[PDB]
Subunit: 231 residues, 3 copies
């Protein structure tokens, strides 16, 4: 495993997702409020699935070689199996916080599915120029998600409990900044133009993934907004 | 891409699914009624996922070669990844229109999963005679779905708002006729007996797919039945 | 098909899952109570998906060869495609019986996903020692599920209708005993240490699968607990 230079970042990612999972699991012990239980379940699942996929990349299972540009290129496909399930869970935490209507939840989850599925097709496409077609369609689906989070969700939170509104605004801003960096890393890294080497690309996705999953969860699960209003 | 004769129908399919997606997206702008939003989300997602899969077949990603009958046969597997998600969404539009109970929705979606999953196993099976075993099991699951749509759903719609009943009856009849043609095309085309060439088979599925997705959606989203009754 | 010694158990499994599906389908004819319909839909789907996967193993589609330990080893991967959908359906029957809160249902289904997904990664891993790492992570996710079924669910059932409590207690005990045997069979069989031959391993999983699906369903669907209380 140590033969690949990016191993150290996969190992550190594995450890941090593991530790984040155990922390949120212990913290959610004994919570009995039904609304809080939903947020603890969603939020604890997200680093638990990322732990399994980081471990699969560390041990070499989650890597394949894709020929493009006359080379055999190493593509970590397990990233997409993680993000297929973890990105809609993160969006569901936001939508539940603002009591989003069911049609908006379905639009967000379906656009997220299209973003990750087209990202995976782009990562495994053997004709170099067509990789960037799939990157553009996936980016258009991310822009729809970010538009709804600012022009659908923001206007509803501002009519709810003040602690729900302030917590949503922080997590919305966290999400828009961190998720917007992923298409840029892909475009400049090994899957795209090849300017940044795989070892630095792996470091960048590790910092983004721990921030967007464990950092986001620490903010949400310390908030009063996840409990029902009660005496 | 132009080396395959069926390319023109894949390109036309891509364009029509793309145009249908953009039309329904613009039309659903500003709709604020929660019931209408659910139907716009479901109905807009369906040509958006079909657009991505038609594009994957145009560019060659969604094609594999399966050896059977002593030949290498071209099988477009991306059709099944589209229909795995788009066929239950179309059934959910019908079920929501009639306020179907949750047990019936689960039976319809699960039978649909079995229909498409066994269709895919049949399309990729290398022993020729066994392809038709999977076709028969998939057809039996389609007959269950059509039985419920006529002997479960029809009897509930007739007790609801008149505009919900008339709109359901039209979309039910559209769905029964168009979906019944898919097993016949598969059986006579490249996946089955091989009587109709792949270029004509691709034309037939394009006409069916645009009719069952964009045609169905134009009927539903122009109806008063998708809005709640309000003053 | 008869060239593999385990064929007879795959054929018997196919038949029993087929017969169980047809029995539950006929029995659920005419049931009109909405709560009972949910349990019939969930419970009938489970042997129907297992029938398709047993048939795929009988015909040879659901088998692949994985090199580990210097051999090419036969791994029936279709077991995991069955259990990915059938194990959360069985857990949903239990959760609905006790009216479990939505956060607990999500935790159970997500832990179940992690159990089966890591089991599949373990079954297809080519480095022998790492197969047992994935077995341990999957077993830890099963222990979480069993903890919730005894220390979350048992305490809620005891506050509901007496027939719901007694039926849950029986099905909980059935589930804990039969599901705990699966990791032991995997560890001693072809996927693991290789002490028990594939033909006996296949017999063991057939007896467990029919008991945990058709046996469990016969107990549940004969119970008064699946109907709403009504005059
Ligand atoms: C939260 C507290 C922790 C804060 C931590 C945030 C750091 C995020 C990582 C960043 C990029 C740095 C990557 C290291 C740069 C190596 C690039 C390089 O030097 O390549 C040289 C090559 O030889 C010729 O260009
Ligand atoms: C809605 C308004 C639009 C209406 C449009 C509906 C048409 C649907 C397509 C049909 C089949 C026609 C396929 C073309 C037939 C070619 C078959 C053929 O001629 O093969 C000849 C071969 O050389 C010896 O058999
Ligand atoms: C519900 C009523 C039905 C009750 C049925 C429950 C049986 C479950 C199966 C069990 C294991 C028996 C497997 C047969 C044992 C064969 C092992 C063997 O003998 O291997 C010999 C080898 O030559 C040297 O060890
Ligand atoms: C080094 C440590 C390794 C890291 C751990 C390995 C992760 C894979 C194992 C298990 C799934 C465990 C459960 C995941 C679901 C927990 C959901 C939850 O917390 O639900 C709370 C809610 O309140 C309930 O009602
Ligand atoms: C593979 C990619 C897709 C699967 C990945 C899993 C991610 C979560 C799934 C779906 C959102 C579906 C809609 C669920 C929103 C319901 C929330 C709500 O509005 O409330 C309903 C509840 O009944 C009030 O108590
Ligand atoms: C309400 C639920 C909404 C659900 C929204 C989901 C939409 C998914 C969209 C797109 C891409 C699907 C791509 C399928 C990925 C297959 C890639 C693969 O595995 O290819 C293997 C091999 O290399 C080649 O044969
Ligand atoms: C709204 C927040 C989300 C927005 C996210 C989308 C932003 C995409 C931006 C830019 C593309 C810049 C293209 C630069 C690529 C040129 C690569 C190249 O070929 O140059 C070779 C290299 O630079 C020689 O050293
Ligand atoms: C040539 C044009 C190409 C075709 C376009 C590329 C398709 C892939 C891109 C994006 C997903 C965009 C969003 C799909 C989900 C829209 C859901 C919706 O409309 O929801 C309305 C509801 O009212 C809300 O609350
Ligand atoms: C991969 C194949 C499966 C996944 C493909 C995605 C297709 C849509 C999924 C599921 C239907 C599940 C049941 C949902 C029906 C609920 C509708 C209802 O009855 O109303 C509930 C709501 O709470 C009242 O406001
Ligand atoms: C409530 C939710 C209900 C959900 C109902 C879903 C039931 C799905 C049924 C069947 C077929 C599954 C077939 C699995 C397809 C794998 C095909 C494949 O990819 O094979 C690749 C390669 O060629 C070989 O190793
Ligand atoms: C209820 C609505 C849905 C019903 C959908 C199911 C209908 C299936 C019907 C028929 C099979 C006809 C079989 C014809 C195939 C014979 C092919 C053959 O071998 O003939 C060679 C060729 O004809 C020499 O030119
Ligand atoms: C030898 C016999 C072979 C075995 C049979 C082949 C299985 C694959 C075929 C079909 C799916 C049929 C329907 C599966 C879903 C049934 C759900 C149900 O029973 O729902 C009842 C509920 O009351 C409703 O409202
Ligand atoms: C691929 C692995 C995952 C997919 C496999 C399919 C298995 C079933 C799925 C999900 C449970 C999601 C939560 C559903 C629990 C809702 C039940 C409930 O509490 O009641 C709600 C209803 O609105 C009151 O009438
Ligand atoms: C609320 C919903 C909760 C959902 C919880 C789901 C968590 C799934 C976890 C893990 C493993 C995923 C493993 C992906 C399996 C891919 C195996 C494969 O097909 O590999 C093919 C080939 O051999 C190699 O390239
Ligand atoms: C709580 C209910 C669920 C608990 C489920 C987890 C139980 C796992 C137990 C034990 C491992 C025993 C290990 C024995 C394996 C040693 C194999 C070996 O190498 O021995 C060679 C062979 O015995 C020469 O004939
Ligand atoms: C837990 C990990 C998270 C929040 C990952 C987020 C990932 C995305 C927002 C990925 C976006 C992509 C594009 C928009 C285009 C090209 C490739 C992707 C998949 C990296
Ligand atoms: C959007 C596309 C739609 C509505 C596609 C519908 C597809 C089916 C009804 C497919 C049916 C099949 C059979 C019943 C048996 C054999 C093969 C299939 C998958 C073509
Ligand atoms: C219908 C079939 C059922 C109920 C199957 C249950 C399967 C499991 C509980 C499987 C468990 C596993 C482990 C806990 C670890 C290693 C391998 C598995 C997937 C066999």
């Amino acid at each position: 495993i140590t033969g690949r230079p990016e191993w150290i970042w996969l190992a550190l990612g594995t450890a941090l997702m593991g530790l984040g999972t155990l922390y949120f699991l212990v913290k959610g012990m004994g919570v009995s409020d039904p609304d809080a239980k939903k947020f603890y379940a969603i939020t604890t699942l997200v680093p638990a699935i990322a732990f399994t996929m980081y471990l699969s990349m560390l041990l070499g299972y989650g890597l394949t070689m894709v020929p493009f540009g006359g080379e055999q290129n190493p593509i970590y496909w397990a990233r997409y199996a993680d993000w297929l399930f973890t990105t809609p869970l993160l969006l569901l935490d936001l939508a539940l916080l603002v009591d989003a209507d069911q049609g908006t939840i379905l639009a967000l989850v379906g656009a997220d599915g299209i973003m990750i599925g087209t990202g995976l097709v782009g990562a495994l496409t053997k004709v170099y120029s067509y990789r960037f077609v799939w990157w553009a369609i996936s980016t258009a689906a991310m822009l729809y998600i970010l538009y709804v989070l600012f022009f659908g969700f923001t206007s509803k939170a501002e009519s709810m409990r003040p602690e729900v509104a302030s917590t949503f605004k922080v997590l919305r801003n966290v999400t828009v900044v961190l998720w917007s960096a992923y298409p840029v890393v892909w475009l400049i890294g090994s899957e795209g133009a090849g300017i940044v080497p795989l070892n630095i690309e792996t470091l960048l996705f590790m910092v983004l993934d721990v921030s967007a999953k464990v950092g986001f969860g620490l903010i949400l699960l310390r908030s009063r907004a996840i409990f029902g209003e009660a005496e």
